[PDB]
Design a protein around this ligand. Structure first.
Ligand SMILES: [Fe+2]
Ligand SMILES: [Fe+2]
Lengths: 196, 195
């Protein structure tokens, strides 16, 4: 059976940028719900004994939706953390200078994409298939692995449940606050894997 | 310029099934926001002096998303009311019995579709070209007028902002509560025109 990976931090660790209440609902209700539902759906299928990522890559319909959401949510929690945020460091800092000119330029363009997305979905920093960092947006449970558009480096959830408790309709303030939480160590891990 | 149609009732009129705070944000931020955005988008375009429905049918992209959300939201508010809900009455009760066998069959089927819908969207009761009632679901700002899948009779918003303040992740409880609000008089008006 598929399980829900632990958070690498306490439920209140992202506060006040993302509240304990939000993490509680988003992780213990939404994310946990996708795991429970996927297990239900893949019993008696060719997917029952495959990795989550193999299910993401091979499935469609409700199985894909729940599988990709589990995967996207885990990537999102790992894309954040306490005493993170601020300026990038290490290789991802260099790669952002190369591909966007500056971190501030990347930040402005990412915020613009995240705020302009219509409906539920995800913003991504990804390494494209030309070894260049790009910003992608996906709808609903979509992600760049399934789309073959790139290797995920970081993600920000912009489904309304990610922010509605703390920010209501004001997604721009959620995005502004999310920059205090970005885990550049996870981005560097992903960059290295992506470039090998 | 396109304007925001007035609610037929006060912001507290649907409580406690949908809170006054919810209606405040949903109407005065989201719905009003679609109006403001559309107006900026259609300035100096051919859409500038056309009706909302014309824009809904003929547009694409961000103009469509905003136009269709304005129309969908108005249809949603008008699909509810205070001291409404419960068992259907008049022509729509008779039509639901005919097309779904009973109100409870319809209620349960519609609830399953509203609860089952992945992502942002809408549930619809519509009339098809054979004068049969059908249940439809659309994604994001989509609606049956745009799709030619039928004439709208009632709608329920299942975007998370519709319910998150009152119910958080519990969409099922929102849907259950919504049955206490259904405006069967509006359904009857719409059925009559549609037939
Ligand atoms: Fe989420
Ligand atoms: Fe809405």
């Amino acid at each position: 059976v598929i399980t829900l990976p632990k958070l690498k931090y306490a439920l209140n660790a992202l506060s006040p940028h993302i509240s304990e209440e939000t993490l509680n609902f988003h992780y213990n209700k939404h994310h946990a719900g996708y795991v429970n539902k996927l297990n239900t759906l893949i019993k008696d299928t060719p997917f029952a004994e495959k990795s989550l990522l193999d299910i993401v890559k091979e499935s469609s319909g409700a199985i894909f939706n729940n599988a990709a959401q589990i995967w996207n949510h885990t990537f999102y929690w790992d894309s954040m953390g306490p005493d993170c945020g601020g300026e990038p460091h290490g290789e991802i800092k260099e790669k952002i200078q190369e591909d966007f000119g500056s971190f501030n330029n990347f930040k402005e363009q990412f915020s613009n994409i995240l705020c302009g997305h219509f409906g539920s979905g995800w913003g991504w920093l990804a390494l494209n298939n030309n070894n260049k960092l790009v910003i992608l947006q996906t709808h609903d449970a979509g992600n760049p692995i399934k789309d073959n558009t790139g290797i995920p480096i970081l993600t920000c959830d912009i489904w309304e449940h990610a922010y509605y408790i703390d920010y209501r309709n004001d997604r721009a303030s959620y995005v502004k606050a999310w920059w205090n939480l970005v885990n550049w160590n996870f981005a560097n891990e992903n960059l290295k894997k992506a470039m090998k």
